[PDB]
Each structure stands twice: as structure tokens, then as C-alpha cells.
Scaffold this active site. Structure first.
Site, PDB file in Angstrom:
ATOM      1  N   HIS A 119      44.881  12.378  20.088  1.00  0.00           N
ATOM      2  CA  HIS A 119      45.194  12.605  18.652  1.00  0.00           C
ATOM      3  C   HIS A 119      46.628  13.080  18.441  1.00  0.00           C
ATOM      4  CE1 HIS A 119      43.338  16.831  18.595  1.00  0.00           C
ATOM      5  NE2 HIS A 119      42.446  16.217  19.353  1.00  0.00           N
TER       6      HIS A 119
ATOM      7  N   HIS B 156      51.767  21.565  18.661  1.00  0.00           N
ATOM      8  CA  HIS B 156      51.702  20.121  18.579  1.00  0.00           C
ATOM      9  C   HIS B 156      52.325  19.694  17.267  1.00  0.00           C
ATOM     10  CE1 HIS B 156      48.307  21.649  16.309  1.00  0.00           C
ATOM     11  NE2 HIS B 156      48.541  20.622  15.519  1.00  0.00           N
TER      12      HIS B 156
ATOM     13  N   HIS C  44      52.345  16.511  13.979  1.00  0.00           N
ATOM     14  CA  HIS C  44      51.796  15.383  13.255  1.00  0.00           C
ATOM     15  C   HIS C  44      52.986  14.577  12.740  1.00  0.00           C
ATOM     16  CE1 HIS C  44      47.823  17.433  13.068  1.00  0.00           C
ATOM     17  NE2 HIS C  44      48.587  18.500  13.083  1.00  0.00           N
TER      18      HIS C  44
ATOM     19  N   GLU D  97      51.631  17.005   7.060  1.00  0.00           N
ATOM     20  CA  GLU D  97      50.300  17.312   6.522  1.00  0.00           C
ATOM     21  C   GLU D  97      50.433  18.090   5.214  1.00  0.00           C
ATOM     22  OE1 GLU D  97      47.890  18.744   9.940  1.00  0.00           O
ATOM     23  OE2 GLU D  97      47.160  16.664   9.780  1.00  0.00           O
TER      24      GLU D  97
ATOM     25  N   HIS E 105      53.061  22.419  14.364  1.00  0.00           N
ATOM     26  CA  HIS E 105      52.082  23.488  14.245  1.00  0.00           C
ATOM     27  C   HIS E 105      52.065  24.336  15.503  1.00  0.00           C
ATOM     28  CE1 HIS E 105      49.676  21.038  11.112  1.00  0.00           C
ATOM     29  NE2 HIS E 105      50.711  21.683  10.591  1.00  0.00           N
TER      30      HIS E 105
ATOM     31  N   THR F 222      43.245  21.353  10.537  1.00  0.00           N
ATOM     32  CA  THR F 222      43.429  20.051   9.875  1.00  0.00           C
ATOM     33  C   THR F 222      42.830  18.916  10.664  1.00  0.00           C
ATOM     34  OG1 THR F 222      45.555  19.522  10.847  1.00  0.00           O
ATOM     35  CG2 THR F 222      45.572  20.858   8.789  1.00  0.00           C
ATOM     36  N   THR F 223      42.197  19.222  11.804  1.00  0.00           N
ATOM     37  CA  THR F 223      41.461  18.240  12.589  1.00  0.00           C
ATOM     38  C   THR F 223      40.035  18.727  12.754  1.00  0.00           C
ATOM     39  OG1 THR F 223      42.372  19.316  14.583  1.00  0.00           O
ATOM     40  CG2 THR F 223      43.372  17.270  13.845  1.00  0.00           C
TER      41      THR F 223
HETATM   42  N1  LIG Z   1      46.236  20.906  13.250  1.00  0.00           N
HETATM   43  S1  LIG Z   1      45.869  22.447  13.316  1.00  0.00           S
HETATM   44  O1  LIG Z   1      47.024  23.216  13.717  1.00  0.00           O
HETATM   45  O2  LIG Z   1      45.245  22.859  12.085  1.00  0.00           O
HETATM   46  C1  LIG Z   1      44.649  22.697  14.465  1.00  0.00           C
HETATM   47  C2  LIG Z   1      44.965  23.313  15.788  1.00  0.00           C
HETATM   48  C3  LIG Z   1      43.843  23.937  16.551  1.00  0.00           C
HETATM   49  C4  LIG Z   1      42.642  23.069  16.728  1.00  0.00           C
HETATM   50  C5  LIG Z   1      41.593  23.616  17.645  1.00  0.00           C
HETATM   51  C6  LIG Z   1      40.374  22.727  17.892  1.00  0.00           C
HETATM   52  C7  LIG Z   1      39.189  23.078  18.785  1.00  0.00           C
HETATM   53  B1  LIG Z   1      39.383  23.903  20.192  1.00  0.00           B
HETATM   54  B2  LIG Z   1      37.881  24.836  20.394  1.00  0.00           B
HETATM   55  B3  LIG Z   1      36.561  23.637  20.507  1.00  0.00           B
HETATM   56  B4  LIG Z   1      38.122  23.284  21.269  1.00  0.00           B
HETATM   57  B5  LIG Z   1      37.237  22.008  20.400  1.00  0.00           B
HETATM   58  B6  LIG Z   1      36.445  22.726  18.955  1.00  0.00           B
HETATM   59  B7  LIG Z   1      36.863  24.466  18.938  1.00  0.00           B
HETATM   60  B8  LIG Z   1      38.586  24.662  18.747  1.00  0.00           B
HETATM   61  B9  LIG Z   1      37.672  23.348  17.861  1.00  0.00           B
HETATM   62  C8  LIG Z   1      37.923  21.929  18.839  1.00  0.00           C
HETATM   63  B10 LIG Z   1      38.999  22.140  20.204  1.00  0.00           B
HETATM   64 ZN   LIG Z   2      48.127  20.452  13.543  1.00  0.00          ZN
END
Ligand SMILES: [N]S(=O)(=O)[C][C][C][C][C][C]C1234B567B89%10B%11%12%13B85%14B%1158B%12%11%15B%139%12B%1061B%12%112C5%153B%14874
Ligand SMILES: [Zn+2]
Length: 257
Positions: free
Chosen positions: A61, A91, A93, A103, A116, A195-196
Site C-alpha cells: 500500500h 510513510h 501517500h 490525503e 505521515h 486513513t487506511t
Molecule cells: N495513514 S495513517 O498515518 O493514518 C495510518 C498509519 C498507521 C496504521 C496502522 C495499522 C495497523 B497496525 B496494527 B494491526 B497492524 B494491522 B491493524 B492494527 B494497526 B492496524 C493494522 B496494522
Molecule cells: Zn498515512
């Protein structure tokens, strides 16, 4: 699985992640005339002198520059924040052309890209626990415009050929994220979300007013990355941005007059 295509992009995410239609989703448009100056907001404290980068990863992504977050080494505090937030990764976008990619938007203006820097609140002990809390993360967002090169970005650009496809990583030590910051730390702030997917509503957003400039050649190298894995049909990693979401019952506050 979710992505940024016609068939799996942002407009589809709500089916697997119903919080996509929630009350505090990100990104948003920042209407500069409506954002209120808040004289109670503090200067942001960005302490990156001891930051320890480890690795860069193409996750299908974007690419993440990862840090050692096993101690307070690179932390964000002050601004709108209570307590201490530790840097875990950054990272970007970006777009297929310079006229889109960010974004957040500013009076509907889209920048070529958005950086970000992701930080988690140390009071929750680990990142996975932090994302379950309304004040779990602080994301520092920085706009990129195309003009002069950003010298501090070039080390990132030059490693991208080694992580072209999803699931590739490369050692990436000794990278100093201070070289990605603009001169001014003036900012807007509001409560929002990742945002993801999973789109969790755990983020205090801090979006800097001053963009950084990167060169056309630098952003062109971002656009040579692939969403696909090695050997699969090439899908250029471009337009990996979620568009602005409804502001709903939120206030965007400005740190500056
Ligand atoms: N574009 S942004 O800066 O708003 C988002 C950045 C952080 C995204 C973190 C995502 C997850 B990590 B942990 B688990 B692993 B898998 B689940 B939980 B957190 B959410 C997903 B991966
Ligand atoms: Zn981001």
C-alpha cells in the site's frame, strides 16, 4: 483485500470496515477560514535527535520507514498532546500526477504527496494497545509540493529500487527524519482516524501548514514502486490516498494566527 483500485478502493472499504462511515474519520479538508486559532495550544515538541531507523518495507500500500520504538528515542509531545508519543514509522501517500496525492486538503487544494510520521502514546505500552484508544496515536502530517529537491529525502528515494514490490524490505539504518521537516512547526489539529483499514478512530492529527518541496525526479521515483508482488502483473503504486471524509461534529484548531 482492500486497496486503491476501482474494485477495492476507498469507496468499498466500509463493507469490511464499517467504521469507514464513522464520526471521526480521516482525512478531512482543512477550511482555513473556519479553523480557529487556539491560543491555548502549545508549540509542538519534535525530539528526533536520537531516532534509530531500522528498515524500509514495501507493504503493498505504501513504504514504511521503521524505527526502533523499544525506548523513548524519537518522541512527539506538546502541541495538543498530553504525554509522550513515540515514533514507530513514517510513510507517504502520493498521486499519479502532481495535482493529487495528499490525503488532507487545504481549502480543497490537493498537494502532490503527504508524509505521515506515526507515533503511539506510551501510556498504553505498545502500538497494538494504543490503536484501541481514542488518544492512542499522534500522526504528524506534512504536505509535499513539487519544486526544489529535498536533500534529506534522497536517501529514501535511492533505496526504493530495492523494495519495488510488495513484501520486499531493506536495511535502512541511520536515517534522520529531521531532514524531512519544514522550517515552521505551525499546525492544524483535529481528532480523527487511521486513513487506511482498519480505520480506527484513535488519532490526534497534527498537520503542518508549511509544505516541504521535493523535486519532480524524487516523486517520479515514488511512482515507480509497485502495489503487486514480485513476478505479478505490474500495478504502479500511485494514488494511494483516501479522499477527504465528512467533518461531522469536529473542530479544526490552528496553532497560529
Ligand atoms: N495513514 S495513517 O498515518 O493514518 C495510518 C498509519 C498507521 C496504521 C496502522 C495499522 C495497523 B497496525 B496494527 B494491526 B497492524 B494491522 B491493524 B492494527 B494497526 B492496524 C493494522 B496494522
Ligand atoms: Zn498515512
Amino acid at each position: 483485500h482492500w486497496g486503491y483500485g476501482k474494485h477495492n478502493g476507498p469507496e468499498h472499504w466500509h463493507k469490511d470496515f464499517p467504521i469507514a462511515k464513522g464520526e471521526r474519520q480521516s482525512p478531512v479538508d482543512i477550511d482555513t477560514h473556519t479553523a480557529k486559532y487556539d491560543p491555548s495550544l502549545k508549540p509542538l515538541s519534535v525530539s528526533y535527535d536520537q531516532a534509530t531507523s531500522l528498515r524500509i518495507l514495501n507493504n503493498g500500500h505504501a513504504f514504511n520507514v521503521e524505527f526502533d520504538d523499544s525506548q523513548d528515542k524519537a518522541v512527539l509531545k506538546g502541541g495538543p498532546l498530553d504525554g509522550t508519543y513515540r515514533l514507530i514509522q513514517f510513510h507517504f501517500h502520493w498521486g499519479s500526477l502532481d495535482g493529487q496525492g495528499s490525503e488532507h486538503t487545504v481549502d480543497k487544494k490537493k498537494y502532490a504527496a503527504e508524509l505521515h510520521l506515526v507515533h503511539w502514546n506510551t501510556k498504553y505500552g505498545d502500538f497494538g494497545k494504543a490503536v484501541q484508544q481514542p488518544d492512542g496515536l499522534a500522526v504528524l502530517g506534512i504536505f509535499l509540493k513539487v519544486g526544489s529537491a529535498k536533500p534529506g529525502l534522497q536517501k529514501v528515494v535511492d533505496v526504493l529500487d530495492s523494495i519495488k514490490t510488495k513484501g520486499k524490505s531493506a536495511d535502512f539504518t541511520n536515517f534522520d527524519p529531521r531532514g524531512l521537516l519544514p522550517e515552521s512547526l505551525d499546525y492544524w489539529t483535529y481528532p480523527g482516524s487511521l486513513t487506511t483499514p482498519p480505520l480506527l478512530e484513535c488519532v490526534t492529527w497534527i498537520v503542518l501548514k508549511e509544505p516541504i518541496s521535493v523535486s519532480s525526479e524524487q516523486v517520479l521515483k515514488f511512482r515507480k514502486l509497485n502495489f503487486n508482488g514480485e513476478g505479478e502483473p505490474e500495478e504502479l503504486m500511485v494514488d494511494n490516498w483516501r479522499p477527504a471524509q465528512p467533518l461531522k461534529n469536529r473542530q479544526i484548531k490552528a496553532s497560529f494566527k
